[PDB]
Short mmCIF file of all heavy atoms in Angstrom, two decimals:
data_model
loop_
_atom_site.label_atom_id
_atom_site.label_comp_id
_atom_site.label_asym_id
_atom_site.label_seq_id
_atom_site.Cartn_x
_atom_site.Cartn_y
_atom_site.Cartn_z
N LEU A 114 -31.21 -167.18 24.04
CA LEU A 114 -31.79 -167.66 25.29
C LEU A 114 -30.96 -168.82 25.80
O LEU A 114 -30.72 -169.86 25.00
CB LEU A 114 -33.23 -168.18 25.24
CG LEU A 114 -34.18 -167.17 24.55
CD1 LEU A 114 -35.52 -167.93 24.52
CD2 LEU A 114 -34.21 -165.89 25.23
N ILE A 115 -30.38 -168.71 26.97
CA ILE A 115 -29.42 -169.70 27.53
C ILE A 115 -30.15 -170.66 28.49
O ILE A 115 -30.85 -170.34 29.37
CB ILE A 115 -28.30 -168.89 28.31
CG1 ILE A 115 -27.61 -167.89 27.32
CG2 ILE A 115 -27.22 -169.83 28.96
CD1 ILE A 115 -26.95 -168.53 26.13
N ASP A 116 -29.78 -171.96 28.25
CA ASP A 116 -30.30 -173.03 29.23
C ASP A 116 -29.93 -172.82 30.63
O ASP A 116 -28.86 -172.48 31.03
CB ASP A 116 -29.61 -174.38 28.73
CG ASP A 116 -30.37 -175.53 29.44
OD1 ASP A 116 -31.56 -175.81 29.09
OD2 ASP A 116 -29.82 -176.11 30.42
N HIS A 117 -30.94 -173.10 31.54
CA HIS A 117 -30.68 -173.02 32.99
C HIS A 117 -29.60 -173.91 33.62
O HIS A 117 -29.14 -173.61 34.66
CB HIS A 117 -32.03 -173.17 33.76
CG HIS A 117 -32.56 -174.57 33.97
ND1 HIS A 117 -32.81 -175.37 32.81
CD2 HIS A 117 -32.87 -175.36 34.98
CE1 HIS A 117 -33.23 -176.56 33.21
NE2 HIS A 117 -33.33 -176.53 34.56
N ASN A 118 -29.11 -174.97 32.94
CA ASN A 118 -28.02 -175.80 33.54
C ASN A 118 -26.63 -175.37 32.97
O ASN A 118 -25.63 -176.09 33.29
CB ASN A 118 -28.31 -177.34 33.28
CG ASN A 118 -29.44 -177.81 34.14
OD1 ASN A 118 -30.33 -178.50 33.68
ND2 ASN A 118 -29.42 -177.48 35.46
N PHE A 119 -26.58 -174.35 32.11
CA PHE A 119 -25.31 -173.88 31.57
C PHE A 119 -24.43 -173.28 32.73
O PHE A 119 -25.04 -172.47 33.51
CB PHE A 119 -25.38 -172.81 30.45
CG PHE A 119 -24.21 -172.06 30.18
CD1 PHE A 119 -23.20 -172.68 29.50
CD2 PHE A 119 -24.06 -170.78 30.62
CE1 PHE A 119 -22.07 -171.95 29.19
CE2 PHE A 119 -22.88 -170.00 30.28
CZ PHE A 119 -21.93 -170.69 29.62
N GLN A 120 -23.22 -173.64 32.88
CA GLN A 120 -22.27 -172.96 33.85
C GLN A 120 -21.04 -172.57 33.08
O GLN A 120 -20.37 -173.30 32.52
CB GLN A 120 -21.93 -173.86 35.05
CG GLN A 120 -23.23 -174.16 35.88
CD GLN A 120 -22.95 -174.42 37.31
OE1 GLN A 120 -22.78 -173.45 38.12
NE2 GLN A 120 -22.75 -175.64 37.68
N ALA A 121 -20.70 -171.21 33.13
CA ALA A 121 -19.60 -170.81 32.30
C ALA A 121 -18.29 -171.37 32.77
O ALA A 121 -18.04 -171.50 34.00
CB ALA A 121 -19.57 -169.28 32.39
N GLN A 122 -17.51 -171.69 31.79
CA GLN A 122 -16.19 -172.18 32.05
C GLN A 122 -15.18 -171.19 31.35
O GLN A 122 -14.85 -171.39 30.06
CB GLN A 122 -15.90 -173.59 31.44
CG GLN A 122 -16.80 -174.60 32.16
CD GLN A 122 -16.71 -175.98 31.45
OE1 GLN A 122 -17.59 -176.43 30.68
NE2 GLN A 122 -15.59 -176.62 31.76
N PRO A 123 -14.74 -170.06 31.91
CA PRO A 123 -13.93 -169.05 31.25
C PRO A 123 -12.64 -169.70 30.74
O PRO A 123 -11.90 -170.42 31.51
CB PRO A 123 -13.61 -168.08 32.32
CG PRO A 123 -14.70 -168.12 33.31
CD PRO A 123 -15.12 -169.62 33.34
N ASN A 124 -12.39 -169.47 29.43
CA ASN A 124 -11.17 -169.88 28.78
C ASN A 124 -9.97 -168.71 29.03
O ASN A 124 -10.15 -167.66 28.31
CB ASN A 124 -11.37 -170.16 27.29
CG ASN A 124 -10.11 -170.47 26.51
OD1 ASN A 124 -9.04 -170.33 26.93
ND2 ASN A 124 -10.36 -170.84 25.23
N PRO A 125 -9.04 -168.89 29.89
CA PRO A 125 -8.22 -167.80 30.25
C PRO A 125 -7.30 -167.19 29.11
O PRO A 125 -6.77 -166.12 29.23
CB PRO A 125 -7.24 -168.45 31.36
CG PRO A 125 -7.31 -169.83 31.11
CD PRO A 125 -8.60 -170.20 30.51
N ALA A 126 -7.18 -167.94 27.94
CA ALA A 126 -6.46 -167.51 26.78
C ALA A 126 -7.29 -166.36 26.09
O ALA A 126 -6.75 -165.53 25.35
CB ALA A 126 -6.22 -168.53 25.78
N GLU A 127 -8.67 -166.30 26.34
CA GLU A 127 -9.44 -165.27 25.73
C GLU A 127 -10.17 -164.33 26.69
O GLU A 127 -10.46 -163.14 26.38
CB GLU A 127 -10.48 -165.90 24.81
CG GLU A 127 -10.02 -165.90 23.31
CD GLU A 127 -10.09 -167.30 22.67
OE1 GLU A 127 -11.07 -167.91 22.89
OE2 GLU A 127 -9.10 -167.59 22.03
N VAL A 128 -10.49 -164.83 27.90
CA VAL A 128 -11.41 -164.15 28.80
C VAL A 128 -10.86 -164.13 30.22
O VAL A 128 -10.50 -165.26 30.66
CB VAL A 128 -12.79 -164.80 28.62
CG1 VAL A 128 -13.47 -165.00 29.90
CG2 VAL A 128 -13.57 -164.12 27.51
N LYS A 129 -10.74 -163.02 30.80
CA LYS A 129 -10.28 -162.90 32.26
C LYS A 129 -11.37 -163.12 33.26
O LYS A 129 -11.11 -163.46 34.42
CB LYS A 129 -9.64 -161.54 32.45
CG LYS A 129 -9.13 -161.31 33.83
CD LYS A 129 -8.08 -160.14 33.95
CE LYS A 129 -8.68 -158.86 33.51
NZ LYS A 129 -7.89 -157.77 34.15
N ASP A 130 -12.64 -162.89 32.84
CA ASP A 130 -13.74 -162.98 33.79
C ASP A 130 -15.01 -163.04 33.00
O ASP A 130 -15.08 -162.75 31.74
CB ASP A 130 -13.84 -161.68 34.66
CG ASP A 130 -14.61 -161.88 35.91
OD1 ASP A 130 -15.25 -162.94 36.20
OD2 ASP A 130 -14.64 -160.92 36.76
N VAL A 131 -16.10 -163.56 33.61
CA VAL A 131 -17.50 -163.70 33.05
C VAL A 131 -18.36 -163.29 34.16
O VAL A 131 -18.18 -163.61 35.37
CB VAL A 131 -17.83 -165.15 32.57
CG1 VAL A 131 -19.24 -165.28 32.10
CG2 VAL A 131 -16.86 -165.60 31.45
N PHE A 132 -19.43 -162.44 33.86
CA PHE A 132 -20.27 -161.96 34.97
C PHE A 132 -21.68 -161.68 34.39
O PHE A 132 -21.82 -161.39 33.24
CB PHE A 132 -19.83 -160.73 35.75
CG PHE A 132 -19.63 -159.49 34.87
CD1 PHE A 132 -20.58 -158.45 34.95
CD2 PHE A 132 -18.55 -159.35 33.99
CE1 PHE A 132 -20.44 -157.32 34.16
CE2 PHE A 132 -18.39 -158.19 33.21
CZ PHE A 132 -19.36 -157.18 33.27
N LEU A 133 -22.71 -161.79 35.27
CA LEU A 133 -24.09 -161.35 34.92
C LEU A 133 -24.46 -160.06 35.41
O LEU A 133 -24.03 -159.60 36.45
CB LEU A 133 -25.08 -162.42 35.55
CG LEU A 133 -24.86 -163.80 35.13
CD1 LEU A 133 -25.95 -164.66 35.83
CD2 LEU A 133 -25.06 -164.12 33.65
N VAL A 134 -25.33 -159.36 34.63
CA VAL A 134 -25.96 -158.12 35.06
C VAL A 134 -27.49 -158.19 34.85
O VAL A 134 -27.96 -158.57 33.73
CB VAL A 134 -25.55 -156.84 34.32
CG1 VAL A 134 -26.15 -155.60 34.87
CG2 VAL A 134 -23.95 -156.66 34.34
N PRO A 135 -28.40 -157.83 35.89
CA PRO A 135 -29.81 -157.97 35.64
C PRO A 135 -30.15 -157.02 34.53
O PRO A 135 -29.64 -155.86 34.41
CB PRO A 135 -30.37 -157.42 37.00
CG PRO A 135 -29.31 -157.65 38.03
CD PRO A 135 -27.98 -157.42 37.26
N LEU A 136 -31.00 -157.38 33.58
CA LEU A 136 -31.42 -156.62 32.46
C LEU A 136 -32.04 -155.29 32.88
O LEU A 136 -31.76 -154.29 32.33
CB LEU A 136 -32.35 -157.35 31.59
CG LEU A 136 -32.70 -156.84 30.19
CD1 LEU A 136 -31.54 -156.77 29.32
CD2 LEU A 136 -33.81 -157.80 29.54
N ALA A 137 -32.81 -155.28 34.02
CA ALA A 137 -33.38 -154.06 34.47
C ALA A 137 -32.40 -152.94 34.83
O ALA A 137 -32.79 -151.72 34.89
CB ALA A 137 -34.34 -154.31 35.62
N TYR A 138 -31.20 -153.31 35.24
CA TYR A 138 -30.17 -152.35 35.53
C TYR A 138 -30.02 -151.27 34.45
O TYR A 138 -29.79 -150.02 34.70
CB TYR A 138 -28.84 -153.03 35.79
CG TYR A 138 -27.60 -152.08 35.81
CD1 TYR A 138 -27.30 -151.41 36.99
CD2 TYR A 138 -26.90 -151.79 34.70
CE1 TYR A 138 -26.28 -150.49 36.99
CE2 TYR A 138 -25.86 -150.84 34.71
CZ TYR A 138 -25.54 -150.16 35.79
OH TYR A 138 -24.44 -149.23 35.75
N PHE A 139 -30.16 -151.70 33.15
CA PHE A 139 -29.93 -150.78 32.01
C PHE A 139 -30.96 -149.71 31.81
O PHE A 139 -30.73 -148.81 31.02
CB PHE A 139 -29.57 -151.67 30.81
CG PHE A 139 -28.26 -152.47 31.00
CD1 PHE A 139 -28.37 -153.83 31.34
CD2 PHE A 139 -27.05 -151.82 30.87
CE1 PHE A 139 -27.17 -154.49 31.56
CE2 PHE A 139 -25.85 -152.59 31.10
CZ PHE A 139 -25.94 -153.89 31.42
N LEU A 140 -32.11 -149.86 32.56
CA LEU A 140 -33.10 -148.82 32.63
C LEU A 140 -32.78 -147.65 33.65
O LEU A 140 -33.20 -146.54 33.40
CB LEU A 140 -34.49 -149.37 32.95
CG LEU A 140 -35.01 -150.45 32.10
CD1 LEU A 140 -36.28 -151.01 32.65
CD2 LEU A 140 -35.15 -150.15 30.61
N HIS A 141 -31.96 -147.97 34.61
CA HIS A 141 -31.53 -146.98 35.66
C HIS A 141 -30.09 -147.26 36.06
O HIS A 141 -29.81 -147.58 37.18
CB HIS A 141 -32.45 -147.07 36.92
CG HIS A 141 -33.83 -146.74 36.61
ND1 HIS A 141 -34.28 -145.40 36.41
CD2 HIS A 141 -34.97 -147.53 36.47
CE1 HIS A 141 -35.54 -145.35 36.18
NE2 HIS A 141 -36.01 -146.60 36.21
N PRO A 142 -29.15 -147.09 35.11
CA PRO A 142 -27.71 -147.40 35.31
C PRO A 142 -27.09 -146.26 36.15
O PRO A 142 -27.62 -145.15 36.28
CB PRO A 142 -27.14 -147.41 33.89
CG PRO A 142 -28.00 -146.44 33.12
CD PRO A 142 -29.41 -146.59 33.74
N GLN A 143 -25.92 -146.61 36.73
CA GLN A 143 -25.10 -145.62 37.41
C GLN A 143 -24.10 -145.09 36.42
O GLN A 143 -23.11 -145.79 36.01
CB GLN A 143 -24.35 -146.24 38.63
CG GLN A 143 -23.46 -145.29 39.37
CD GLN A 143 -22.91 -145.87 40.63
OE1 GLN A 143 -23.66 -146.17 41.62
NE2 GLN A 143 -21.59 -146.00 40.72
#
C-alpha cells in the first residue's frame, strides 16, 4: 500500500515510463 504523498520519479537508466491503471479495469479488460 503506497502513501498518498508519493510522486514517482522515473529513473531513465531503468524505466522509460510509469503509469497507473484502475484495479477494476482487470475485471473487464480490452
Side-chain angles (χ1 to χ4, degrees):
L114 310 178
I115 303 300
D116 192 73
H117 77 302
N118 292 129
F119 167 73
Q120 294 208 87
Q122 298 175 256
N124 175 353
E127 263 130 41
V128 140
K129 179 159 62 154
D130 199 356
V131 175
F132 65 102
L133 299 179
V134 183
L136 190 64
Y138 168 83
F139 297 98
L140 305 176
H141 296 286
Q143 180 174 296

